[PDB]
Design a protein around this motif. Structure first.
Motif, PDB file in Angstrom:
ATOM      1  N   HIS A  63       0.574  -1.144  -0.026  1.00 19.60           N
ATOM      2  CA  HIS A  63      -0.020   0.047  -0.021  1.00 19.60           C
ATOM      3  C   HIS A  63       0.744   1.487   0.251  1.00 19.60           C
ATOM      4  CE1 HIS A  63      -3.045  -2.913   1.454  1.00 19.60           C
ATOM      5  NE2 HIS A  63      -2.285  -3.711   2.549  1.00 19.60           N
ATOM      6  N   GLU A 197       3.184  -0.489   7.357  1.00 19.03           N
ATOM      7  CA  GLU A 197       2.872  -1.929   7.707  1.00 19.03           C
ATOM      8  C   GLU A 197       2.995  -3.708   7.855  1.00 19.03           C
ATOM      9  OE1 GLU A 197       2.571  -4.373   4.171  1.00 19.03           O
ATOM     10  OE2 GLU A 197       0.922  -4.605   4.103  1.00 19.03           O
ATOM     11  N   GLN A 216       4.623  -3.266  26.031  1.00 20.69           N
ATOM     12  CA  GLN A 216       3.572  -2.756  25.175  1.00 20.69           C
ATOM     13  C   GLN A 216       4.418  -2.305  23.755  1.00 20.69           C
ATOM     14  OE1 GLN A 216       5.090   0.963  28.613  1.00 20.69           O
ATOM     15  NE2 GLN A 216       5.183   1.718  26.235  1.00 20.69           N
ATOM     16  N   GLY A 219       1.286  -4.066  21.218  1.00 17.96           N
ATOM     17  CA  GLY A 219       0.239  -3.120  21.338  1.00 17.96           C
ATOM     18  C   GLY A 219       1.060  -1.808  20.645  1.00 17.96           C
ATOM     19  N   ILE A 220       1.412  -1.935  20.367  1.00 11.58           N
ATOM     20  CA  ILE A 220       1.931  -0.929  18.832  1.00 11.58           C
ATOM     21  C   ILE A 220       1.503  -1.203  17.500  1.00 11.58           C
ATOM     22  CG2 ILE A 220       2.742   1.446  18.325  1.00 11.58           C
ATOM     23  CD1 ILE A 220       4.522   0.937  20.966  1.00 11.58           C
ATOM     24  N   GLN A 222       0.283  -4.249  16.959  1.00 14.30           N
ATOM     25  CA  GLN A 222      -0.787  -4.594  16.514  1.00 14.30           C
ATOM     26  C   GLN A 222      -1.752  -3.188  16.634  1.00 14.30           C
ATOM     27  OE1 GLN A 222      -2.302  -7.214  15.811  1.00 14.30           O
ATOM     28  NE2 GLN A 222      -4.554  -5.575  15.689  1.00 14.30           N
ATOM     29  N   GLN A 223      -1.863  -2.172  17.163  1.00 15.67           N
ATOM     30  CA  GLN A 223      -2.196  -0.676  16.872  1.00 15.67           C
ATOM     31  C   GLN A 223      -2.176  -0.909  15.309  1.00 15.67           C
ATOM     32  OE1 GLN A 223      -5.068   1.544  17.052  1.00 15.67           O
ATOM     33  NE2 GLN A 223      -3.757   3.238  17.858  1.00 15.67           N
ATOM     34  N   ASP A 231       1.138   6.363  13.042  1.00 18.18           N
ATOM     35  CA  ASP A 231       1.399   8.018  13.287  1.00 18.18           C
ATOM     36  C   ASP A 231       2.935   8.271  13.797  1.00 18.18           C
ATOM     37  OD1 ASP A 231      -0.950   8.323  15.702  1.00 18.18           O
ATOM     38  OD2 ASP A 231       1.127   8.781  16.331  1.00 18.18           O
ATOM     39  N   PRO A 233       4.073  10.057  16.576  1.00 15.29           N
ATOM     40  CA  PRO A 233       4.793   9.267  17.743  1.00 15.29           C
ATOM     41  C   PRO A 233       4.875   7.826  18.099  1.00 15.29           C
ATOM     42  CG  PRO A 233       3.019  11.789  17.938  1.00 15.29           C
ATOM     43  CD  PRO A 233       2.691  10.901  16.496  1.00 15.29           C
ATOM     44  N   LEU A 234       3.849   7.504  17.699  1.00  8.49           N
ATOM     45  CA  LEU A 234       4.045   6.070  17.981  1.00  8.49           C
ATOM     46  C   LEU A 234       5.237   5.168  16.994  1.00  8.49           C
ATOM     47  CD1 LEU A 234      -0.027   5.638  18.027  1.00  8.49           C
ATOM     48  CD2 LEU A 234       1.277   3.662  19.309  1.00  8.49           C
ATOM     49  N   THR A 237       7.909   6.075  19.770  1.00  3.56           N
ATOM     50  CA  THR A 237       7.556   5.024  20.837  1.00  3.56           C
ATOM     51  C   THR A 237       8.439   4.000  20.584  1.00  3.56           C
ATOM     52  OG1 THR A 237       5.928   6.191  21.990  1.00  3.56           O
ATOM     53  CG2 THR A 237       6.038   3.992  22.455  1.00  3.56           C
TER      54      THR A 237
END
Lengths: 287, 564, 258, 273, 272, 272
Positions: A63, A197, A216, A219-220, A222-223, A231, A233-234, A237
């Motif tokens: 994508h 991706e 943690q 979790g990111i 998976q987000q 985005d 900030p993530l 992190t």
């Protein structure tokens, strides 16, 4: 009804900036193998077409809206048209392999395209299902995916090479495999240090293996898989979690070991053949 | 860090204000480490002989006045000098000529490795100016006639490589500069390049004119003396004085030029001041070297040498077995000699049809096939695309097992036709374009009759000799049969749109009535929204029935069957 | 006022209910039984209110869910106040040792729900032991809470039978969950793992069709009818509908034994 | 079995930057109410946990991607997991109020939590259904939603206070109420002068009340509700509409009056002691 | 090329109708007795105005269907439908001038101003989710729905042959009551026999009688949030409406309006 | 009241404007010599019509901003803006009736018919992705954009005090050329320094001169489907236009139109 709407996506990706790694690899292997300029140009065309088709397909299945800072092929011709063009380009390549005037050049093509597709299948499976592979499973895939074109070019070159030099194939194939691994790990480092991706990489597997309880990072990861992208900030992190498990230094150790292997193999081949290559020593200083 | 180090070279004293009538007011320097400079040039001479061939035209070494880069680049750092002079020797012999391809690339890479191992950023600049020079020299007609001096000077600025040498000086100086100052300095430095080029024309003329008079195949030359022949026809030695003067204007042109910058920032911008002051040092070095270089005077060459002598396929074959397990109504196997050959052809047909169906379902967004879920809803889109790409390679090997050299070419040409047809179908579906009837009928002769033609042309080749003329007839039958299948599929789908697909009745409906806006609007609604709901489909069918385009289709079906 | 706080709680307490928790509810006086029934009712109501949100379920008992009449945020706030109100109700029971029982049981229930939510979101398939340990806390937690609170306020005597009753409650909750797994596919829209699904994915380590369908379900928000029937066919071929009925019999045997 | 997925959202938000207002408040109250250090640390932990739970919940129900420039809890763990971890922190605090060795401390908890939930419920209703409350109604909502924690801490702090000091109960409750009102008016003024989720504020109610026929403001306030958020050009238009109605000066006057009340209460309390 | 302009205007005319406006025009002609060509002209004016109103209403309510058949903006798009609806007003301007009366133009303009005011209030109440009072709702539907009847009757009294002119206020009152009746009838039929968040007569009574029913108010807001309601929630709304006597408070209004219509019609026969 | 009807009109009137219409009227007044009151009436008519046109265009073009300020439909909604634009069209009919001329309405009606025809063709071409010819494009933009100028010119000539015999055809030609020049100027300005897939003279020249440029057509279809062109795609379109030579063609057309403008002004000055 003649041409166009078929070669158009193929011509758009050809008229684009390119570094030229594979062509230089062929020209640097020619110093050891000594082939006529005609055959070298044919092999270069084969390699160019294969790389272009690979990029066309890989941009659809990422994508990715842009490539080299310019719009991708599927953002100008549609996904279906690009898929059709990339499908034709494999038939067009088999028209070139047959013009190399050797029945044994088709078997090599048909036996390493299998390996390329097997590697890309595992890559796609891991990406879609979000399943983290092991280090062995990841390194064997990128040796069969990013180091498959190099093996094609090598094994075809050492087949058109005028007799004598056929015992060089083993070392010249180990060199191709280690070069493919190096090129994948280098890109993995470059993207990170200087996942939208949900593409796994060498830094990420070390983080997800060394820390089996880091809830943690998972979790990111998976987000990103659900929302479709991370985005800024993530992403910061995630890049910070990789600077606490020592995943940006483990990559450096691997890179150094791979480059040591490449230098040793080049020295062995240069001691077995004769005078310095000077052409495979420049594609190394450029990494 | 922006001050020229005067200790690296010492001024050369001269008794006259000018040098053979050139360079009045310039001060000449010679570097303090000439022993390093000669080393680089001799390395290239050794390597060039080893990798390319024997040399004759001498190069940059001059034992009496000094090395080329010594007098032309007097402020280069000691650690960067040998590489700098190596490139100069290469430039001389490369211009001459312009295993061989191996030596040329090996040597182009031996020195392009020394440069990039010394200073990565500044070496990135120099290689483009080289690439620009070699591209511009080759892409410019050597037979071009020059109407005026100004026109020629623009050519000669890039021909003699004065910018290339300028890039070299920056590398030897460690001077890096931004783009903005570059736009400031081209008019400033432009006279300097002309002065360098014209002096090279003037001094090299004698040997070049000797090469002229030796080479009878000569078109218009790149040479000030020879090109001034066209404008002020006169005697060469008298022209030499004229060439002496016109260049001499440039000798003081750039010399004075500076003023422009000096007035602007030539009192505070030290970096450009030192840069444009060093650029002023280039003009005297060229003439001092060119007074007695072996590169122009072959007779001292013997004398010159005298002194100088001292894992698994489980994700690849995952979509390929699911699509081969769904119920089939095989009409291609029925269309298909020894038993095993027929079985091989049936396998080829099955695999090709499965790949085509796998790709077709993606470009239709159809979630169902034979009532069962589609392939991209069980294995994803990308994996199905990847498997549909390896199915072609798998079929490709199956063809070779049907041992015949000519079954290869038939496969390749037939697949090219199939892809062309599919490309036209996809273009018409996306870019909202209604084809003509001839275009639509010719597209379905390739997209749908391609497989039948492929199989027929393979089985006529595999068949035991006997049958001779049954090639044209069978191929025509296959084309008409594929057309009949496509028209039948178009008919069935309507009488007993959701992806904006043009059909045979729809083309007639849109053509026979050039003014019907309702049908076109509903088609555009299908295009935009994504599909049509049931009332809109009933509206489309009502329009088709009113247009009399459903019985136009049955006339095609009956006529096609008559041909079959 | 209190109209926007007690709203969702009143709405969820008016829908038709099965009342198994009240039937589950030692010679206790009547008012204590009514108090415990009220506690169980409000706790189950809060659990349903939160579960409907974490499953995107438009309907409950055929009737609309609470978050489609009041909104997500108000439902969440009302559930939090429902926990506070259960706290108030237990206080009125006037027994200092019920306090710790309630707190510990709530902690266990929240741990179980946390594991269930992590497995649902991250697409990680648990093992049989992990799944059978989670449902001993998420679903058997309420029964254990009510039993432990009932034993303490019972007149002496019935004090050594706490362990037997707790084991019975855990096995009963396990039975309820395994039953609800059976009677949900033998009669995925939120990618919820189950006993048959775990058996199918464990017994067959190379089945890519089932895993692909599950992944499609994850990034679609649910499965449509043909793919659900495909999942059913895969489970029925794998012998997971029958492997579940062996667990249901074994659990019922332990219920009879315990 | 484990706690890694329960105490993951709780620990994430507990490692973020903070201001510490709720703890400085306890430290300041400790002067008039001399307390042992151990009890003060217990109460600080209680306040920190309650504040963390409130922040966790008010970020899901504000559709806020970021918090203090860093990603929010529900964007790292998920909405359901964050809710589950936040409803457990209420139980966890309920074990800490029980360690303060007072039966009466549980009643205070159970009453102020009820008031907090009522206030948040009213705010949620006015946010969902775009119904503008009156100035009084808004001022009674924020005396419970925001001043609830301060009152909760205060009334559970004069209970462990060694004997003597019990008369300073009503004064401290009024102080806490005024502090809660001020800390919300200040935030509204800061947010405006220096609506994406369509949240009402003290400046934005005066504009809608003083100007009953402002159709432009009432439509920009609906575009945000429909689309999901306002763009910068629409934010500038709202700010210009509020500036012409004199809403900002009204907010400044309310802030001044509230601070006058705070200093009066402080001077009285230090007078008594 | 009047083909992309008149197109949407012919599709909405081809659709089946009920012919209420034509019957109303015929109805007042017994009392006003005026020639046939003028009657045809007035019926054409009414048909064009009604078609334009339907074309605009279908867009402003997201209605995919009309008379079972697809709407105009699903065959020609939104912008072209708006353009044709805007041109229909200009066409009616041409049609009115052929009636040969300067006062007809003033009547037409005033009636359209009232119609647009009513429609504006309807749109404002629909978008902002503000519940009107009974008085405000009845004032709005008296202009939005009774505007066409008033327009036609005021043109009829002017065109009709001299003599009878004092019977203009009576007919205007009749037209207003008839439009009110038609709108309340539509509300009741749609309810018994708000996917676009429409306020109806039964709903206002429920929202006024019960100022504390949070369930109905939350379902109404879910309608706004999701842009429509599903069947279970519609059944919930219907159940809520019949527990406050909002269906029995609508039949009283219909009966009173019919009694008023009958009395007005009877009074219109004693002066003729 | 009319707080919800006149809201969008007042909002769009408050916005900054250029004043081309008013300046054109003031410029024609020196030749026509109308009294000040009639000139102000005509300026009011022009302003109202232009504001309605912009209100409708912003909706029919998905433009979220106008003059760097939020659009009308982003403050009042689509339906309210449509209703207000329709009432604005009705309102102008009450202004052209205070010019004390029966012939001033026929001009209004016919020029409005032409305006709507032109806009209909634009909408059909935009929606269906059909490329018009240069002749068709220039015929269209002569009516949509040269419509207001021609309307104002004809009304001014009708109200012009006596004389003004031959000064009708020349002024109409001037108005047509002026409208064409404005549209081409806007085209050139927007391109030099596609989101809605709007065709233009530079784009038509490109699509016609190159009958086989698949890349440009693909990018246009991407714009049509996705909803707009992100920046690198727009730069690719600009590069295609520069390669095809469309910008120079646009500049030549601009100069050739300004020559006619100058000649027409010289001729009319000469007569008067």
């Amino acid at each position: 009804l003649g041409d166009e709407h078929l070669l158009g996506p193929a011509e758009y990706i050809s008229s684009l900036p390119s570094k030229g790694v594979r062509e230089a690899f062929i020209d640097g292997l020619n110093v050891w193998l000594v082939l006529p300029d005609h055959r070298v140009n044919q092999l270069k065309s084969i390699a160019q077409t294969l790389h272009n088709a690979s990029l066309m397909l890989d941009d659809i299945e990422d994508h990715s809206p842009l490539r080299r800072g310019r719009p991708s092929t599927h953002m100008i011709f549609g996904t279906e048209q690009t898929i059709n063009s990339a499908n034709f380009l494999l038939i067009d390549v088999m028209e070139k392999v047959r013009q190399l005037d050797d029945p044994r050049c088709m078997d090599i093509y048909l036996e390493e395209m299998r390996n390329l597709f097997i590697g890309q299948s595992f890559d796609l499976y891991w990406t879609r299902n979000g399943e983290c592979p092991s280090e062995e499973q990841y390194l064997d895939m990128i040796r069969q995916k990013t180091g498959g074109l190099f093996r094609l070019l090598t094994r075809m070159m050492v087949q058109i090479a005028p007799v004598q030099q056929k015992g060089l194939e083993t070392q010249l194939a180990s060199l191709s495999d280690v070069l493919g691994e190096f090129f994948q790990v280098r890109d993995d480092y470059k993207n990170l240090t200087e996942l939208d991706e949900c593409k796994f990489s060498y830094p990420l597997i070390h983080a997800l293996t060394s820390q089996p309880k880091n809830v943690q990072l998972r979790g990111i990861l998976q987000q990103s898989r659900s929302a479709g992208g991370l985005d800024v900030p993530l992403k910061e992190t995630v890049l910070s979690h990789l600077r606490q498990a020592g995943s940006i230094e483990y990559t450096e150790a691997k890179m150094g070991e791979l480059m040591e292997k490449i230098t040793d193999s080049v020295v062995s081949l240069e001691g077995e053949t004769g005078s310095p290559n000077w052409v495979v020593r420049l594609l190394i200083h450029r990494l």
